[PDB]
Every structure is written in structure tokens, then in C-alpha cells.
Design a protein around this ligand. Structure first.
Ligand SMILES: O=C(O)c1ccc(OC[C@H](C2CCCCC2)n2c(-c3ccc(Cl)cc3)nc3cc(F)c(F)cc32)c(F)c1
Lengths: 230, 12
């Protein structure tokens, strides 16, 4: 029922690693302060996305057993999850409680940031569906670790090795879902279902960058590797 | 060929 001492140790370790990220307040304060051009927002995006990948690699390296994995599988896991992890973190940031009217202004600013119309609606639909779950910080951290340690990622040679590392994280998350939401026995299943919805963002992530309403689409060499853009 | 990702993974 309750977390065991080993699970409590695992949870605080994942939380400490997860907390090394930029505070949501920092990101939203920047976007709410003043409106920027599509060109200025494109550069803000590439800076933030580059920093997110760097922080994600350090978080991933700290995941128990990750560094014991086959090196090619390590690359396949990071490359397969980087985009999904960024959208999950964007959903967390979007659903953080702000003063009256601020979340509406934040949504309006992102809606007019330069991103194409085709990608706007699905993005906010995902953020609002994530928001309805009313996830705790621990749920976001564990869910991010579960996304990274996905054994059914493309090019993974040894699935079982990845399964073994993901399994205890799923066990902790399931227990937390039962504790934080005993009224909703579907909470855990819903979280896992949202991970399938996250995967549809990989299908058009490169296009979301390429279709940004700017004249030139300059990317950092690290972003080119992770987002499949030139 | 994920040269930078490889470097970030293999450093330290
Ligand atoms: O923690 C991190 O490391 C981190 C890294 C990158 C992020 O995305 C920034 C961009 C904005 C860039 C400037 C112009 C407006 C959008 N952004 C996105 C987003 C839209 C499009 C794409 Cl392709 C990717 C992400 N969805 C958002 C939802 C939010 F609540 C939010 F505050 C900003 C959001 C981020 F949210 C967090």
C-alpha cells in the first residue's frame, strides 16, 4: 500500500534530480512581462529547448541503472524521449497556478508566438488534458523518468534491460496515484494513457519548428541532433 | 550521427 523505505529513497532522489530545472516562474514571468515578435520568440524557444536537452541528459544520467545500459541504447532512449519530455515539462509549466487572468495572457502570448495554427490547438488540448489530472510535482518527475525509460522505443536492442529500470518507477508512481487520489482508481491508467497521447508530438515536432512564422530558421547543433532539423 | 548527444552522455 504505502511506499517502502527503498521507494521513499527512490522518490526523493528522482525529485532532487528533477528540481535542478529552471523554475516555472522564470519561464512564465519572461513570457508574461512583454510581448515579443515571432522572430524574438523563435530564438527564445531555441535557447530554452537547448537548455532543456542539456538538463534532461543530466537528469537521465542520474536515473538508477541508466549508465549500466548498452551505450547505443542510451542514445536511443535519450533521442526517443527528448521532445516528449520537453512537451511534458511545458504542460507542467502551463498548469502551474498563476494570479487571476495570467494563465489566459500566457495562453494568448503562446498562441501568437509565431507557431502555426495547425499545431496550436493539439498542443493546448494536450496541456489542458494533462491539467485535468491535477498532477503533483512527484507525479511529473516520475512520469518524465518513465517516458525516458520507455522499453518500446525505436532501435532499442535490449528491451528487458530497459523494462527492469522502468518497473520500479511505475510501482512508485502507481502507489502515489493511490495515495494522492484514492477517490479516482483510474488516475494511474489515465497517466499512462497521456504518455500515448504525448507520442503524437514526435510525428510533427520538426514541422512545429520549421513552420514558425519567421524568415530564417536557425538552430543550435545540439537541437538539430535532437529535433531532426537542419 | 548524434555526436553531441554521445559526448554529453560519455563525459565525466
Ligand atoms: O522547462 C523547460 O526547460 C522548458 C523548455 C522549453 C519550453 O517551451 C517554451 C515555449 C515558449 C517559447 C517562447 C514562445 C512561446 C512558447 N513553450 C511551449 C512550446 C511551444 C512550442 C514548441 Cl515547438 C515547444 C514548446 N509550450 C509552453 C507552455 C508554457 F506554459 C510555457 F510557459 C512556455 C511554453 C518550456 F515551456 C519549458
Amino acid at each position: 500500500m504505502e511506499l517502502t523505505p527503498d521507494q521513499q529513497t527512490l522518490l526523493h532522489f528522482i525529485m532532487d534530480s528533477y528540481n535542478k530545472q529552471r523554475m516555472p516562474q522564470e519561464i512564465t514571468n519572461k513570457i508574461l512581462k512583454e510581448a515579443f515578435s515571432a522572430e524574438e520568440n523563435f530564438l527564445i524557444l531555441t535557447e530554452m529547448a537547448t537548455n532543456h536537452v542539456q538538463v534532461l541528459v543530466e537528469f537521465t544520467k542520474k536515473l538508477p541503472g541508466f549508465q549500466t545500459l548498452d551505450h547505443e541504447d542510451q542514445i536511443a532512449l535519450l533521442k526517443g524521449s527528448a521532445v516528449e519530455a520537453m512537451f511534458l515539462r511545458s504542460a507542467e509549466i502551463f498548469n502551474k497556478k498563476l494570479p487571476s487572468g495570467h494563465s489566459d495572457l500566457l495562453e494568448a502570448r503562446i498562441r501568437n508566438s509565431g507557431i502555426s495554427d495547425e499545431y496550436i490547438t493539439p498542443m493546448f488540448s494536450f496541456y489542458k488534458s494533462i491539467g485535468e489530472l491535477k498532477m503533483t510535482q512527484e507525479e511529473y518527475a516520475l512520469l518524465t523518468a518513465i517516458v525516458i525509460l520507455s522499453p518500446d522505443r525505436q532501435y532499442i536492442k535490449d528491451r528487458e534491460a530497459v523494462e527492469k529500470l522502468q518497473e520500479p518507477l511505475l510501482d512508485v508512481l502507481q502507489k502515489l496515484c493511490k495515495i494522492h487520489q484514492p477517490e479516482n482508481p483510474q488516475h494511474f491508467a489515465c497517466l499512462l494513457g497521456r504518455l500515448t497521447e504525448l507520442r503524437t508530438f514526435n510525428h510533427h515536432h520538426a514541422e512545429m519548428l520549421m513552420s514558425w512564422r519567421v524568415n530564417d530558421h536557425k538552430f543550435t547543433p545540439l537541437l538539430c541532433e535532437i529535433w531532426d532539423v537542419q | 550521427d548524434h555526436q553531441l548527444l554521445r559526448y554529453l552522455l560519455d563525459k565525466d
